[PDB]
Amino acid sequence: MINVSDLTQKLPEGSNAGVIAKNINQNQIIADYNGSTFMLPASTQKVFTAVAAKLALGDQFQFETALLSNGKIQNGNLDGNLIVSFTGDPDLTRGQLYSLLAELKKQGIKKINGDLVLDTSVFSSHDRGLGWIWNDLTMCFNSPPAAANIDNNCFYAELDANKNPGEIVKINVPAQFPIQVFGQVYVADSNEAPYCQLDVVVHDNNRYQVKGCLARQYKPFGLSFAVQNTDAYAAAIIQRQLRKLGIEFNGKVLLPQKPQQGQLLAKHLSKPLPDLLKKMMKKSDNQIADSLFRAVAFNYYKRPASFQLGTLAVKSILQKQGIRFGNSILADGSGLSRHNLVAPKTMLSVLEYIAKNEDKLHLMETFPIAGVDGTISGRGGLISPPLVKNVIAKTGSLKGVYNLAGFMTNARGEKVAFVQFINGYSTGDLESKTKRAPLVQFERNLYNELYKY
Amino acid sequence: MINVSDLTQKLPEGSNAGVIAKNINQNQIIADYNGSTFMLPASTQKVFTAVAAKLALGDQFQFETALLSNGKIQNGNLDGNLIVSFTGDPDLTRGQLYSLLAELKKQGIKKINGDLVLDTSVFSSHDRGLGWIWNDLTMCFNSPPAAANIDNNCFYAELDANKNPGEIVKINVPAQFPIQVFGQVYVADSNEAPYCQLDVVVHDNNRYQVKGCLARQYKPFGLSFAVQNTDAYAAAIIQRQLRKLGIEFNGKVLLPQKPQQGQLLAKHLSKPLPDLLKKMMKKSDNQIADSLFRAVAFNYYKRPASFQLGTLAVKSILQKQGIRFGNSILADGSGLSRHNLVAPKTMLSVLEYIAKNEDKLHLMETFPIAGVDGTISGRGGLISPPLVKNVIAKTGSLKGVYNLAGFMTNARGEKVAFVQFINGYSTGDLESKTKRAPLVQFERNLYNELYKY
Question: How close does chain B come to A8, measured CA to CA in Å?
Fold first, then answer.
């Protein structure tokens, strides 16, 4: 086999790698180094979710966002409540929601007599996986994969830190967002600037407290945040939109937990599963992953889905196909949880299933392709022949974690499936930028060895 | 050297272990298996905090909680604000605070004319380490090591769920706690129960919403929750106590966030550092650890301390004594962060420093003693001869992580220092109780091998 132990001497001191690779045509393992060790899979976890979603939801699945009522329409009034049903569409834009609501206007509703009721009942329990780190929850990449999700549950604030040290940065929220940012951030000089932290503290109803400092910046810039209370944000946007449409509305916002029965007025359907999977896999979309993870359970078990039921469904679906998980921990669909524990050989067994069933599943084309697209379009170890355009791989990147899972063609035209997990990679501080040079050397050498073996 | 690799065959599949040990008398490393691999140290991290606190704060250190004013006491009235200064004491009880406020009555105050002002300025930025997991922040063990800390920033409530399926669980919070717990949790039948989740959601001002369901219970179901807004909670308690003492107060609660000058009226002193460190090390107290971590930084840098300044101070103080951290990540003093990364050999260097300097430091007597006290008083693998009453070790336990760092005497009477980090330990699903029998067999074996080597 390949001497992976020798290759990991160029990784930073203290890191740990697990690497396993199989030549599919020969059915031969060709590298096997800590392949049974549980490691953090990061976004390579989304491969499990991709396979489960293909199997349990299928290619015609779409997320539905719908308007319902039990009132009768009568001289241009809807004489009852407006129900807006959100089912976790991770690709719903504010424009799509507006076009949905504009269906009421097409139907002659000029006024809604009752309340605005959101039905979010397809998801249950928290909208964050267990073991997610608290301080990342205000980052847009970790926005909640909630039932209501509008423009990726992300917004941004406008900052003007072109000020002298000691002065207050100007931080305004743009008009389109129903958010408050409060608190004060001061500009730090060059001698405190490298120590600066901008802290963000969440309070109720999408109010964000900022504290701390920032180095001067001449130009005004935007900082993105995750929406915290997704039901309040959606209800606020819906009421802004009814006003823009001229539909009179004067009622309360109601947030019941159960499914809300009513007559269907209009519906918007997302792009179908293959499109959602492709974006998930190419771009490493956490929200698409975790939405599918719970939509899989909701459809599979016919009951409201928590992250725990997501775990039970994904394991039950993949087990039925022959995948064995032992005591792996799959706490979410995205890979974000720090409780996740997967060994390289388990991920490889899923990659082998995806290769074997490609004629039906068509998941190979969802993988990022080295030096071409997705999150490896510029990956340093991969951007030269014979790897560029050849290696396809899902990345998993978290603090200290540099993983790849995917396939390549070797010098004989045979397909090799491979899993690379590297954890504990630290070359500087907390909140230092990590030297990627050892990782580029390692990967260039490993995938060249796999190509020629 | 000891063949630790074979010993690990007894640990669950997928686990990873890092084990290093030195015979101090011989100056010989006798076990060295993944000794340079960065792993999660969990509460063995508290060993670094203990040494830094001894060196920088010293055995006379006490935390101070004080009452100050700028007004004159005249005619039984304090004619100014009452300032209460909190400095992180992690062992301040409600009864201690009541006795401290009673001192105002001894000085003849029966009314305060102004406002209640808290000074929590010695700590800055967040009161949580970065990389802590979000869903544990409501649990008492993970209460915030904030400047204001009263009865460990924990309170208890009880759910009476001894009722039929379909009934609403009654929430009972003792009257002394200025918090609210609300919600409608229902009893589920035996078919639905396996699908339930009992959740808590934190709202502003220490209002906790319980949600979900649970099986009928056949004894009272306790909740132990961490206080979330620690200045609100302390100001609430202070005002109830002022009222019970017969000190009239009608003013505002002010939280200015900067140091407050005034005349010292009364100061309560905690127990001194050796008592604090003994409890922290024997019982694994996260709040004593992180409060000392930031107290070390406040006293060492003479400025308000964040967790980042705690990490700079602990490394700076230990590096002067010869410890080398390389690219370790030390994100807190407790070890709770999932960002922490340290190799077994670096922890072993600190244990050797503790043993070499025992005549000055007196830290040996803080380690739990196998089968006798602290957190290994009934540790399965250590409770028989020749290990019981001999091995002393600080534990580190988190989900997935079973560590020990300490010392023992071998069959020749020579002292051995050792570090065992196990991460990745999984024996079933995420919510199940972990099976310790593998750990017990591995530890009995390992420490027997160290005793006989």
Answer: 12
* Rounded CA separation A402/A434 (Å): 11
Per DSSP (E only), the strands in B10-115 are 16-23, 28-33, 64-69, 73-74, 77-78, 82-85, 111-112
Which CATH number do you get for residue A251?
Answer: 3.50.80.20
How far apart CA A167 and CA B205 sit, in angstroms, is: 30
Cα separation, B172 vs B175, whole angstroms: 9
The phi and psi torsions of A411 (rounded to 5 degrees) equal -70, -15
Of B134, B135, B426, the CB nearest to A329: B426
Closest-CA residue of chain B to A185: B125
DSSP string, B241-300: HHHHTT-EE---EE---S----EEEEEEEPPPHHHHHHHHHHHT-HHHHHHHHHHHHHHH
Pairwise CB contact (< 8 Å): B197 & A306: yes
Hunting for tokens 């706490």 — which residue is that?
A: A331
Measured between beta carbons, the chain A residues lying within 8 angstroms of B16 are 16, 34, 37-38
Q: CB–CB of A135 and B135 under 8 A?
A: no
CB A240 within 8 A of CB A150: no
Q: Indicate the length of chain B as a whole number.
A: 453
Residue pair A332/A354 in contact by the 8 Å Cβ criterion: no
Give me the residues paired with residue A39 across strands: A342
The resolution of the experimental structure, rounded to one decimal in Å, is 1.6
Measured between beta carbons, the chain A residues lying within 8 angstroms of B36 are 13-14
What is the domain extent for residue A99? 63-123+230-270
Of A38, A211, A424, nearest to B14 by CB-CB distance is A38
Taking CB atoms and an 8 Å limit, are B329 and A212 in contact across chains?
no
C-alpha radius of gyration, chain B, whole number: 24
Answer with the one of A270, A300, A326 that is the final residue of a domain. Answer: A270
What the block records as the tokens of B134 is 């979000």
Instruction: Give the gap in angstroms from C-alpha B376 to the nearest C-alpha of chain A.
Output: 25
A147 shares a domain with A2: no
Asked if residue B160 and residue B132 are part of one domain, the reply reads: yes
Q: Between chains, do B14 and A327 touch, taking CB under 8 Å as contact?
A: yes
Interface touch A14/B197, C-beta < 8 Å: no
> Domain holding A448: CATH number?
3.40.710.10
Helices assigned H by DSSP within A45-199: 46-56, 94-106
